[PDB]
């Protein structure tokens, strides 16, 4: 297999669209821009995600809701992430927050909360909280719930 | 700093390329700015001269045309072969050209 053989698969490298290059291309003259007006101009229109021609926008007519926060900003309080029993399936022996981080299950800087989707497995699971149904499934399967503080 | 010339006035050179390939001759002159040598009786050209005090009767003269120095090879005075040149340090220790075929000085 040699340099002359190396080919990208079909569709892997598509040509770009070139406008403003003659009549046969069917993108000549106006360059697919239509005729005249703001959108044909260099610079074009306002943020069409928001602006609506001068009338008050869809967005700005809906009510704000809830606590938006104040200076000096977010209040530091402990944060919990749940991981379900089913995600604990893969482990044997002990699970702790740290292992769960490594598995790519628990994100750093969150506390562990175990949740109920799935089946419990007789493991020693150490966490900051358990849901009602998690505790239940866990006790019943002869696993061992351990609270951290 | 200086142009490198592997050949000089008037060691004996073989003309190794061009119309005169094969000829042997003394280097009458070295022109480093043009990187060229004049070899005796090699590269003759017919130049027109005006009827002048220097040349009354006018007509033409023969002149030696310069050769690009790379066309030329010194002939070793010991072995008589055309050669590349090497440098050898003496005891002085001045340095000198020596033939690359045998070890002979080229001056």
């Amino acid at each position: 297999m040699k340099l002359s053989d190396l080919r990208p698969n079909p569709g892997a490298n598509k040509r770009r669209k070139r406008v403003g290059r003659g009549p046969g291309s069917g993108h000549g003259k106006t360059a697919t821009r239509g005729h005249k007006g703001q959108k044909s101009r260099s610079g074009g229109l306002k943020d069409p995600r928001r602006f609506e021609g001068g009338r008050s926008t869809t967005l700005m007519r809906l009510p704000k809701r809830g606590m938006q926060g104040q200076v000096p900003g977010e209040i530091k309080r402990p944060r919990y992430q749940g991981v379900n029993l089913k995600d604990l399936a893969r482990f044997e022996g002990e699970v702790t927050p740290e292992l769960l981080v490594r598995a790519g299950l628990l994100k750093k800087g969150y506390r562990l909360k175990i949740l109920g989707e799935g089946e419990a497995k007789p493991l020693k699971v150490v966490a900051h909280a358990f849901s009602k149904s998690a505790l239940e499934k866990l006790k019943a399967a002869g696993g061992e719930p351990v609270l951290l503080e | 700093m200086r142009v490198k010339m592997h050949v000089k006035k008037g060691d004996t050179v073989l003309v190794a390329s061009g119309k005169y390939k094969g000829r042997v001759g003394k280097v009458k002159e070295v022109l480093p700015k043009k990187y060229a040598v004049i070899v005796e009786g090699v590269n003759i050209v017919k130049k027109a001269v005006r009827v002048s005090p220097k040349y009354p009767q006018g007509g033409f003269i023969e002149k030696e045309a310069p050769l690009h120095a790379s066309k030329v090879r010194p002939i070793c005075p010991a072995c008589g072969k055309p050669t590349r040149v090497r440098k050898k340090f003496l005891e002085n220790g001045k340095k000198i050209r020596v033939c690359a075929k045998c070890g002979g000085a080229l001056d």
Binding site: R50, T58, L59, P63, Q68 | -
Partner: protein
Amino acid sequence: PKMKTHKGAKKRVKITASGKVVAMKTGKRHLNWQKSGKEIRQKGRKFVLAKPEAERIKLLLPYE
């Protein structure tokens, strides 16, 4: 440069699990004395923004 989150959108709207856009019913900020109870109550819920409008708002929230 990276896109900026539109703060009026972040403050008015939420993108649901399946990407619908949700906002509070408009119309009971005030002038409510003569509104029926069916009215005030119904305006107290969230509704799901019309597709083309939600689709626009969704693009202003590039990192939710």
